[PDB]
Design a protein around this ligand. Structure first.
Ligand SMILES: *[C@@H]1O[C@H](CO)[C@@H](O[C@@H]2O[C@H](CO)[C@@H](O[C@@H]3O[C@H](CO)[C@@H](O)[C@H](O)[C@@H]3O)[C@H](O)[C@H]2NC(C)=O)[C@H](O)[C@H]1NC(C)=O
Ligand SMILES: *[C@@H]1O[C@H](CO)[C@@H](O[C@@H]2O[C@H](CO)[C@@H](O[C@@H]3O[C@H](CO)[C@@H](O)[C@H](O)[C@@H]3O)[C@H](O)[C@H]2NC(C)=O)[C@H](O)[C@H]1NC(C)=O
Ligand SMILES: *[C@@H]1O[C@H](CO)[C@@H](O[C@@H]2O[C@H](CO)[C@@H](O)[C@H](O)[C@H]2NC(C)=O)[C@H](O)[C@H]1NC(C)=O
Ligand SMILES: *[C@@H]1O[C@H](CO)[C@@H](O[C@@H]2O[C@H](CO)[C@@H](O)[C@H](O)[C@H]2NC(C)=O)[C@H](O)[C@H]1NC(C)=O
Ligand SMILES: *[C@@H]1O[C@H](CO)[C@@H](O[C@@H]2O[C@H](CO)[C@@H](O)[C@H](O)[C@H]2NC(C)=O)[C@H](O)[C@H]1NC(C)=O
Ligand code: NAG
Ligand code: CL
Ligand code: ZN
Lengths: 596, 193
């Protein structure tokens, strides 16, 4: 028996032995995320520790077979993932210390409360306290308090823990044959071995910048338009040439500028296409929202939801009797078990969120035929690109009236289309310089380019330069504002949200193109198009088996990510944005600060 | 005297697919109005002869084989398959003349903690001949290593057990399967007036 043949029978034994432990570990994690009990949180970690102990055991057993001997492309990829030494490449105490600081960062982030100096009896945490302020408040001082308090309280507690988090994670990456931790994360996009489709960890930094360089003109005009509107909501607070203060940006971190729509709406006299009143006034329930969702995917050529999904998914707030987590999630427990956890409210936002997470399930139901190690998105940004394509098609007013939530007499002016694209722009393009600048800083910090004496000093140099945002109050190195965001404090890579935004519009344009769509790209509903469905299905089933570049070609017909579909989606807004800045200044001076 | 078909179908416990069982039926009248007059089955696909004129037919003796397999692997109880079960657990001949029956048994063959009794063979050197049966528990040699009666690196215990949980999908759910093989011979049993 050859080295390849032994590795194959090892993968055979592994798949059937991993399927049963992953289900037990995922069911235990479902028993906690739907039923917060101390019996289920210990049931969670015991099945989760057994799963990790099984992995680190099998990780070494995968190293029994040297990768250089394998010519089968599938078995080679699977053995590669299992041999990832990962956290096991650290010493016992350093690895144990690393696990401790990862939970505390998650803890002080999830349990950090800021207290009002005016009313010290009222102390709020991020959700719902601080986020509600940063999203709804219009008082400059009130938004300044909420923005700064979270960074001077939670972020300051995170500062020493993040310094140690970088050096310990760097010890893991270099011992795993990587340049830094940012190199480790960029390895998700790496394709090594396939002729003509290779893609290096350095290739990501090059391409994201080349596409970001071409993203600047649209964002520069959206910035100047939003800036002038914000000068009206905060007079004598914003310079018409300077950057936008970080606390007036819609949420705690400026990630999405959605909440500025009430301020930046082009034509506020128009009736919004928000059918939230229609959903509540028609006695719709959580069942109707998700059964209507399933109807969407089937009418495109995709399979139904399993009966296990129907009886076992949690689609409502579990009431006062059952305390649970309510983060909208789509569960793939394996062994043909697919579920969606969501404390659904009868609102338009949930009708689009139901289509997002159910898009994940259809992706999960498709690649379930792949082996256990290849049941995953082509890269980290593929799954969320699928979830948003449903949100895009389901948001069109033609789709709203085809379901019965929008009246047939809704007239689609060039104003209501500009209202919608501006609505989509504040949340989509506004987060791209944010996402890039964030990961760009993290990549440099892991690379050692930003010494600890100028972490926050360099952080805001890129904030004013790249995204166009200025701090409202001066921050020294005692703060750790990067770690004040969930993904940074919870060890989540962030470049996947930039790459998903580019993937999703390549998908949507090609799928609407296959659906013979003719009008504006934003006006496209994919329903009733069984042709475009099988087109997308050709990619969903591949999982992680095929290289992400190859899987991208089967739907879009391209080898690399492209920004032109994103540009073409926002083309009616970009020309109208050029007009609205005819007597306004595009661009920003990096030197203006809302202080002395 | 009636043929005891209910003794192979309505039986309490069923065997594992790797160690399946057979039951030979001889001289007795055969009432097949129990099977075709029943929407209870999840498969009911015949081979070699129709599903209705089997009432008026006679065979030397009929062989009823029964076992339990996951919902997905019922696909392999057909002539000429090459899955894990068809190759290492229960192989059918290309000249198979008979019917395959199957019905979901999640309520009685799947438990909360998982019914690990039902097993299947994953490793075996050489395929199975049609209607062959192997109860071997020998430590399978996957590499060039002697196993010395011990399992581990390049030596894998061949049997794997289904973990039948009642919340699995239709594919990973237990399905009791009974296969009715028909033996023809020039010798002088199972008719049905
Ligand atoms: C790497 O090794 C794997 C071994 O699993 C190869 O995949 C397997 O290739 C065989 C040969 O074509 C496939 O067998 C076929 O199975 C179907 C099942 O319906 C049967 O009808 C055919 O008659 C045939 O026996 C098998 O399905 C396939 N399995 C998987 C999971 O892909 C693979 O081709 C090898 N790749 C390379 C690059 O060497
Ligand atoms: C396993 O047990 C069940 C129930 O004990 C058996 O099903 C039963 O089969 C009999 C005969 O086929 C059915 O009785 C009646 O037969 C007359 C014949 O004229 C027919 O006209 C009636 O409509 C009725 O079918 C009986 O209803 C039926 N009961 C159930 C619950 O299905 C079954 O035969 C046993 N398994 C095997 C393999 O025999
Ligand atoms: C919530 O979790 C608990 C255990 O963490 C589940 O179990 C209950 O508590 C004990 C545990 O042995 C049993 O005796 C009870 O009969 C269980 N049920 C109830 C209703 O108390 C409990 O079932 C879980 N709840 C839900 C709705 O899944
Ligand atoms: C997808 O599932 C739906 C279930 O809502 C199927 O609708 C079937 O249609 C009739 C009329 O309501 C029902 O009596 C059937 O029982 C429904 N089937 C099921 C399984 O509930 C629809 O046919 C399914 N389509 C596909 C392609 O799977
Ligand atoms: C796709 O075509 C079908 C063809 O029937 C349309 O289905 C009907 O249309 C209206 C809403 O457009 C519903 O109120 C009817 O009940 C639908 N019929 C049935 C039997 O359900 C469907 O609307 C079309 N979808 C589009 C154009 O997006
Ligand atoms: C994992 O680490 C061990 C030493 O701890 C080393 O021998 C082995 O080659 C490493 N494997 C991989 C895939 O990095
Ligand atoms: Cl910040
Ligand atoms: Zn999602």
């Amino acid at each position: 028996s050859t080295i390849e043949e032994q590795a194959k029978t090892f993968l055979d034994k592994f798949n059937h032995e991993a399927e049963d432990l992953f289900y037990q570990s995922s069911l235990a994690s479902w028993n906690y995320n739907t039923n917060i009990t101390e019996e289920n949180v210990q049931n969670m970690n015991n099945a989760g520790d057994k799963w990790s102990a099984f992995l680190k055991e099998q990780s070494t057993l995968a190293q029994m077979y040297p990768l250089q001997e394998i010519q089968n492309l599938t078995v080679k990829l699977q053995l590669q993932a299992l041999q990832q030494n990962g956290s096991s490449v650290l010493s016992e105490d350093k690895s144990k210390r690393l696990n401790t600081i990862l939970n505390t960062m998650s803890t002080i982030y999830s349990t950090g409360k800021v207290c009002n100096p005016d009313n010290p009896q009222e102390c709020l945490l991020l959700e719902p306290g601080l986020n509600e302020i940063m999203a709804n408040s219009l008082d400059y001082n009130e938004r300044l308090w909420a923005w700064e308090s979270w960074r001077s309280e939670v972020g300051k507690q995170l500062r020493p823990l993040y310094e140690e988090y970088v050096v310990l994670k760097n010890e893991m990456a270099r011992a795993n044959h990587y340049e830094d931790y940012g190199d480790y994360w960029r390895g998700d996009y790496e394709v090594n071995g396939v002729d003509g489709y290779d893609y290096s960890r350095g290739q990501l930094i090059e391409d994201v910048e080349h596409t970001f360089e071409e993203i600047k003109p649209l964002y520069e005009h959206l910035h100047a338009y939003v800036r002038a509107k914000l000068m009206n909501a905060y007079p004598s607070y914003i310079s018409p040439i300077g950057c936008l203060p970080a606390h007036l940006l819609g949420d705690m971190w400026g990630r999405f500028w959605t909440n500025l729509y009430s301020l930046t709406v082009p034509f506020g006299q128009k009736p919004n296409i928000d059918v939230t009143d229609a959903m509540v006034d028609q006695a719709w329930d959580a069942q109707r929202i998700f059964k209507e969702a399933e109807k969407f995917f089937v009418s495109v050529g995709l399979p139904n939801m399993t009966q296990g999904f129907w009886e076992n998914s949690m689609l409502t707030d579990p009431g006062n009797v059952q305390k649970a987590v309510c983060h909208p999630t789509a569960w793939d427990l394996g062994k043909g078990d697919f579920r969606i956890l969501m404390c659904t409210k009868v609102t338009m936002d949930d009708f689009l969120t139901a289509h997002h997470e159910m898009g994940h399930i259809q992706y999960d139901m498709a690649y379930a035929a792949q082996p256990f190690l290849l049941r995953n998105g082509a890269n980290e940004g593929f799954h969320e690109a699928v979830g948003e394509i449903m949100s895009l098609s389901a948001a069109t007013p033609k789709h709203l009236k085809s379901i019965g939530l929008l009246s047939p007499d809704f007239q689609e002016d060039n104003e209501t289309e500009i209202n919608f694209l501006l609505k989509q722009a504040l949340t989509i393009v506004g987060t791209l310089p944010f996402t890039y600048m964030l990961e760009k800083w993290r990549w440099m910090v892991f690379k050692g380019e930003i010494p600890k004496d100028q972490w926050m000093k360099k952080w805001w140099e890129m904030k004013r330069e790249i995204v166009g945002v200025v701090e409202p109050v001066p921050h020294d190195e005692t703060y750790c504002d990067p770690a004040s965001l969930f993904h940074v404090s919870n060890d989540y890579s962030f470049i996947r949200y930039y790459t998903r935004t580019l993937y999703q519009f390549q998908f949507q344009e090609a799928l609407c193109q296959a659906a013979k769509h003719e009008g504006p790209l934003h006006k496209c509903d994919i329903s009733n198009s069984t042709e475009a469905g099988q087109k997308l299905f050709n990619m969903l089933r591949l999982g992680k088996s095929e290289p992400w570049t190859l899987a991208l070609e089967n739907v879009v017909g391209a080898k690399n990510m492209n920004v032109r579909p994103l540009l073409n989606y926002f083309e009616p807004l970009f020309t109208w944005l050029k007009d609205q800045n005819k007597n306004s200044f595009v661009g920003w001076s990096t030197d203006w600060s809302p202080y002395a | 005297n009636l043929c005891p078909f209910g003794e192979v179908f309505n039986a309490t416990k069923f065997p594992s697919v790797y160690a399946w069982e057979r039951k030979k039926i001889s001289n007795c009248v055969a009432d097949y109005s129990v099977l075709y007059n029943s929407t209870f089955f999840s498969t009911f696909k015949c081979y070699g002869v129709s599903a209705t004129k089997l009432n008026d037919l006679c065979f030397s003796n009929v062989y009823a084989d029964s076992f339990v397999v996951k919902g997905d692997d019922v696909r392999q109880i057909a002539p000429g398959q090459t899955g894990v079960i068809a190759d290492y657990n229960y192989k059918l001949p290309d000249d198979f003349m008979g019917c395959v029956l199957a019905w979901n048994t999640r309520n009685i063959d799947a438990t909360s903690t998982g019914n690990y009794n039902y097993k299947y063979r994953l490793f075996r050197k050489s395929k199975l001949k049609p209607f062959e049966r192997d109860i071997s528990t020998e430590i399978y040699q996957a590499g060039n290593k002697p196993c010395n009666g011990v399992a581990g690196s390049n030596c894998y215990s061949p049997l794997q057990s289904y973990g039948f949980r009642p919340t699995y999908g239709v594919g990973h759910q237990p399905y009791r399967v009974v296969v009715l093989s028909f033996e023809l011979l020039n010798a002088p049993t199972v008719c049905g007036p």
